[PDB]
Symmetry: C3
């Protein structure tokens, strides 16, 4: 199968300068070369160039609406295109906000896709619920059909079309949920596994459920939109919103491994890596290194080891 790395150097989704530098940091780390060594064909589509909308006045609270709307629009166009060509897309972020268009394009080619959202936050705040204008906790709100019209249309997102509903998504590792955001997910009965559920059940049982829940009936394309703020800071320290008591480098690798083993991996988002927020070159190397680790995992690097077929090492 083919792999399409797509650059997403964006940051307007939030107030902390840095996330744009993400893809550059991941690539430098040897992301593209390492992948090749896998059983997949890899093509690096490069980084998209986002046109900065001048005088992007705030829509009430929401910040840089037009900038974000446009950037995403462009992305959904590219994702949609490669998905069309039947290649598995891999979106290197900026900030999560770009999850909007990375799923949009995908649903376009695969309308019956399910979504496994790895984050510590729901990011389902609507333009009426955000405490900050950061589109960085609103991605899911623009994607849900259930939340359609449940808030004013925003400058620049006129193009988005709620592609998935609450019966297709599954959060994993929630540990910082705002009131409004807890309300919504309880209201729309959205399937999740906050850190407590993980604790209780175990990464293993949790992955077993998310799977029978999102695939029990129909086997469909899976979209893994991973927030690096998903794991604990001790592994992914260079992020905008580090929340203590998160997913272990193991638990998380487990995840990307099982999902590899489903063979249904279609789209993948590596978001919120921020090479500048590193308190020491070490925390930035650490952060990056595991990010690359998850990715290679999603594409078959097993911890039990790997060997090329048909080769007699004896």
């Amino acid at each position: 199968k083919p792999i399409e790395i797509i650059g997403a150097p964006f940051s307007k989704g939030q107030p902390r300068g840095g996330v744009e530098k993400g893809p550059a940091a991941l690539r430098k780390a040897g992301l593209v070369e390492k992948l090749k060594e896998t059983e997949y064909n890899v093509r690096d589509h490069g980084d998209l160039a986002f046109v900065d909308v001048p005088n992007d006045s705030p829509f009430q609270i929401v910040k840089n609406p037009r900038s974000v709307g446009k950037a995403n629009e462009q992305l959904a166009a590219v994702v949609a295109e490669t998905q069309k060509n039947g290649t598995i897309s891999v979106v290197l972020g900026g900030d999560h906000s770009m999850a909007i268009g990375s799923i949009s394009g995908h649903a376009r080619v695969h309308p019956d896709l399910c979504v496994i959202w790895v984050d510590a936050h729901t990011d389902i705040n609507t333009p009426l619920t955000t405490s900050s204008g950061n589109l960085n906790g609103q991605p899911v709100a623009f994607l849900l059909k259930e939340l359609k019209g449940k808030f004013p249309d925003v400058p620049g997102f006129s193009w988005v079309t709620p592609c998935i509903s609450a019966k297709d998504i599954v959060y994993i590792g929630l540990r910082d949920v705002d009131p409004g955001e807890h309300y919504i997910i309880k209201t729309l009965g959205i399937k999740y596994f906050s850190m407590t559920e993980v604790d209780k059940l175990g990464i293993g049982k949790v992955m077993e459920e998310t799977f029978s829940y999102l695939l029990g009936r129909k086997k469909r394309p899976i979209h893994l939109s991973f927030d690096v703020d998903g794991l604990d800071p001790v592994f992914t320290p260079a992020t905008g919103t580090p929340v203590v008591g998160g997913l272990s480098y193991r638990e998380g690798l487990y995840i990307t491994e099982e999902i590899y083993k489903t063979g249904l991996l279609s789209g993948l988002d590596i978001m919120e890596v921020n090479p500048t927020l590193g308190k020491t070159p070490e925390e930035v190397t650490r952060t990056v290194n595991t990010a690359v680790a998850l990715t290679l995992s999603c594409f078959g690097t097993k911890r039990e080891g790997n060997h090329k077929p048909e080769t007699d090492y004896l």
Copy 2:
């Protein structure tokens, strides 16, 4: 329901100066204000003032017997009083030694209470078994009916009355148990879950058992007497007796969460926080911060998030 924060600036229970400063540190951290924001009414009864008994000569080995006996006596009086008024008590420690009177008063109003003891040590050394005169590993011995007369009466505790028996308590996170102390618990068949049991079972299954075991038949009031030396030092580093390989900030939060969900939370002890034993302002902030975290958990702060009822955030 009402909440009564009760100050317990005591330290004679052990040889390391510092634990008295605990409550001041926790409050500074915003313990009382944060609680209010919960669905409970909160009243800060302040810190008790412990009268120092002059010439408190050692009872054989046991140190500062009178000082401790008196301090506890006073506490059991206050706890007993608020419990009477039907409010859920929350004892901010010093050292664990004050667990004696914090449960005493409680049993007085609720004679059929069960106890979930979170610590890394049993603290069930009797005046004949302690290697050190520290009443800080003897709290349970003064509370157990089974251990009645199994040791000489001590100067100042004449007042205590073994309120609970071995069939009502459950340890969680034992990792440093002295010979005498392992003997006793094996002798009186005391239900526990040392780190190994947690490992084997899982925080989840463990909380499921402790619950069917202590509540299967009769639903009763629960007294959560939490030692901060319960979790691993990497989370609660500022303590008198740090033992490696302990309860994760998650596992522990899981606990305080399930117990919240039983609705049977009556008395709560936050003991052995010691702001002075911090190797760096960081370890003291860390220690404190989680202590406050457990507490707010016990009172409903879920990791899956929270929202006030009847409010349409839409």
Copy 3:
């Protein structure tokens, strides 16, 4: 039962100077004295003195073949001898390479022994498969009957005799497996539990399987050859090959505990501790301390606590 501590100050098995100093560091830490306090008799046989073969030219790739071969030869002689005297051997390493002769001697007295290999690496690279000439990933290849003649004989190991086969060994904590090494283990159907299996199953279930698998039918002597690179660096940081996402100080202690509880503990290897690779005296103290911790565990120190029999602490 008797315990024989055997010194193995060796390092030629790899390119990083330091592992020889291991035993000195462990002993300094109070390894021998602490053991005595256990229910076993302890004798410290001292450290062996390894004769340095001059002009030990490389066998193709393999480095210092003769040096390693000879050192091991000597060890297998001593191990074989004490095992004969029916005492449980405990080999303090250098590098793992010495696992070769520490098992050799053992099989000599106990030909039907099983092996639980705790490491993060398989160390089953054959002289044809190693990327480096480091006999430090080849121990298992010289021990397996299945790999007999599957590579050229090496200068100095003429003496070794494949004592165990693939149906007697069980790896635990694999997280860095080379191609050739993954091939072999898949080819010879070698039972393992890479970090993922641990994640999935749980230390508990994993120890339950390894046991029904290696002892279900015949109860036999167990040889625990522990690599300190088995646990995560956060606990055992002073090692040649630290791999992220490993065995927790708990999971590992669990292990040495269950194996204690089988009563079948015969030989034990504490390898790759390297006091010099410590970035801070702390990481070296940490590393050592847990190493000693595992060992005392293997010999009965329970986390639930311990008490001498027949003694009334009351």
